[PDB]
Design a protein around this ligand. Structure first.
Ligand SMILES: CN1CCN(C(=O)c2cc(-c3nnc4ccc(Br)cn34)c(O)cc2O)CC1
Length: 208
């Protein structure tokens, strides 16, 4: 297990998201679905010139999996997945300018719902989650687990759990007061409201 510090700008963004009073929290799901859709677009495009890239799974989709027992909501996609360098370096550097611009906007009166327009909507996960675990598998690398409860650091390790094939699974460990996002009709309402134009199937797994 390796522990890393977030880029300073991102640690500051995370602390702001965690500490600011903001009731419109449902936007997190829209942002995570939009990120999955982007990862799905990338594998779909790559597969046009090299169909062997889908050997690890031909189905391109998004699953939403609430678990009231564990208090987690999982967003799974079969997109391109992330390499170790993506997890440690790349996502951070690509987010840096967006993060700085977003913090500046928040100063000039802009609101948290605009986070997506700056390309850093992933961190809106911390509106509802006390901890986020991400399991990922890219065709060119091993399966990894990323995890952060914020506070300035994240961890990366090789994942010895169930094999994913290809893609990314975001597991939100929800804050005690945010269990509404585990409810079937609330999830449907949110997806219909924000995510009605995504070009891949989004399937809600209903709890038994
Ligand atoms: C460069 N790309 C983008 C998306 N992608 C992915 O595999 C991918 C990334 C994120 C994601 N978006 N922001 C972050 C931040 C930290 C972590 Br961990 C994951 N993040 C996500 O929610 C879903 C995804 O399918 C493929 C590779």
């Amino acid at each position: 297990v390796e522990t890393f510090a977030f880029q300073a700008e991102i640690a500051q963004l995370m602390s702001l998201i965690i500490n600011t009073f903001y009731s419109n929290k449902e936007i997190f799901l829209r942002e995570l679905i939009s990120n999955s859709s982007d990862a799905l677009d990338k594998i779909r495009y790559e597969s046009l010139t090299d169909p062997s890239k889908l050997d690890s799974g031909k189905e391109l989709h998004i699953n939403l999996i609430p678990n009231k027992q564990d208090r987690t909501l999982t967003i799974v996609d079969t997109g391109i997945g992330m390499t170790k360098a993506d997890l440690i370096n790349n996502l951070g550097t690509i987010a840096k300018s967006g993060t700085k611009a977003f913090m500046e906007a928040l100063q000039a009166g802009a609101d948290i719902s605009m986070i997506g327009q700056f390309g850093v909507g992933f961190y809106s996960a911390y509106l509802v989650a006390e901890k986020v675990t991400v399991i990922t598998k890219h065709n060119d690398d091993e399966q990894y687990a990323w995890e952060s409860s914020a506070g300035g650091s994240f961890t990366v390790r090789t994942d010895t759990g169930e094999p994913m094939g290809r893609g990314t699974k975001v597991i939100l460990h929800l804050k005690e007061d945010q269990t509404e996002y585990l409810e079937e009709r609330r999830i449907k309402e949110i997806v219909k409201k924000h995510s009605q134009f995504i070009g891949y199937p989004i399937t809600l797994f209903v709890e038994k």
